[PDB]
Design an enzyme around this catalytic site. Structure first.
Site, PDB file in Angstrom:
ATOM      1  N   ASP A   1     -24.811  -3.457  44.159  1.00  0.00           N
ATOM      2  CA  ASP A   1     -24.995  -4.311  45.361  1.00  0.00           C
ATOM      3  C   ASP A   1     -23.716  -5.108  45.663  1.00  0.00           C
ATOM      4  O   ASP A   1     -23.735  -5.864  46.680  1.00  0.00           O
ATOM      5  CB  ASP A   1     -26.251  -5.166  45.242  1.00  0.00           C
TER       6      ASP A   1
ATOM      7  N   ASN B   1     -25.871 -12.666  36.718  1.00  0.00           N
ATOM      8  CA  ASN B   1     -25.541 -12.002  37.999  1.00  0.00           C
ATOM      9  C   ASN B   1     -25.086 -13.067  39.016  1.00  0.00           C
ATOM     10  O   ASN B   1     -25.763 -14.106  39.158  1.00  0.00           O
ATOM     11  CB  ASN B   1     -26.783 -11.179  38.394  1.00  0.00           C
TER      12      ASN B   1
ATOM     13  N   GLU C   1     -26.405  -6.152  26.562  1.00  0.00           N
ATOM     14  CA  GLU C   1     -25.766  -6.602  27.822  1.00  0.00           C
ATOM     15  C   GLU C   1     -24.251  -6.590  27.636  1.00  0.00           C
ATOM     16  O   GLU C   1     -23.530  -6.188  28.578  1.00  0.00           O
ATOM     17  CB  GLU C   1     -26.293  -7.987  28.194  1.00  0.00           C
TER      18      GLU C   1
ATOM     19  N   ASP D   1     -21.885  -9.115  37.017  1.00  0.00           N
ATOM     20  CA  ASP D   1     -22.596  -9.705  35.857  1.00  0.00           C
ATOM     21  C   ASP D   1     -21.520 -10.242  34.923  1.00  0.00           C
ATOM     22  O   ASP D   1     -20.539  -9.512  34.673  1.00  0.00           O
ATOM     23  CB  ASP D   1     -23.434  -8.661  35.129  1.00  0.00           C
TER      24      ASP D   1
ATOM     25  N   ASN E   1     -22.068  -4.678  39.786  1.00  0.00           N
ATOM     26  CA  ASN E   1     -23.356  -4.085  40.187  1.00  0.00           C
ATOM     27  C   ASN E   1     -23.131  -3.273  41.477  1.00  0.00           C
ATOM     28  O   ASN E   1     -22.265  -3.625  42.320  1.00  0.00           O
ATOM     29  CB  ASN E   1     -24.417  -5.180  40.360  1.00  0.00           C
TER      30      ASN E   1
END
Ligand code: NA
Length: 129
Positions: free
Chosen positions: A48, A59, A35, A52, A46
């Site tokens: 959308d 998120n 990550e 993060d 992200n």
């Protein structure tokens, strides 16, 4: 802060992540490697439009507030900036809520794609824990 591998393993174990919801310490270290590369300051946008944050790339769509994720929730009741601290307490507390949400560590797509089913104990090899 860029954690060492065993350094982060010790911190996650102290904070009660070893075998939390049945996930061994090496699963969490493996998730953190892919990550964030163990970097508390890691941020990634992200598609959308959520972001993060931190060692476990938590998120803003669901878990923290960053003020720029329309229609989003803040279920860990924390500013997303608190997830970038050198002290991983907030990330760990929030990660315990995420992994409890129903899908276990599949919540972390990097865990599902890169750690799940692998020899995750290798990630704590050599560590004095
Ligand atoms: Na949010």
């Amino acid at each position: 802060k860029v954690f060492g591998r065993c350094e982060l393993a010790a911190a996650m174990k102290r904070h009660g992540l070893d075998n939390y919801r049945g996930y061994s310490l090496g699963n969490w270290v493996c998730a953190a490697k892919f990550e964030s590369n163990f970097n508390t300051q890691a941020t990634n946008r992200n598609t959308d439009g959520s972001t993060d944050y931190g060692i476990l790339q938590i998120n803003s769509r669901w878990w923290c507030n960053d003020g720029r994720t329309p229609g989003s929730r803040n279920l860990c009741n924390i500013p997303c900036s608190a997830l970038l601290s050198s002290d991983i307490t907030a990330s760990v507390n929030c990660a315990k809520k995420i992994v409890s949400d129903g899908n276990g560590m599949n919540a972390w797509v990097a865990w599902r794609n890169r750690c799940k089913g692998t020899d995750v104990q290798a990630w704590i090899r050599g560590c004095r824990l």
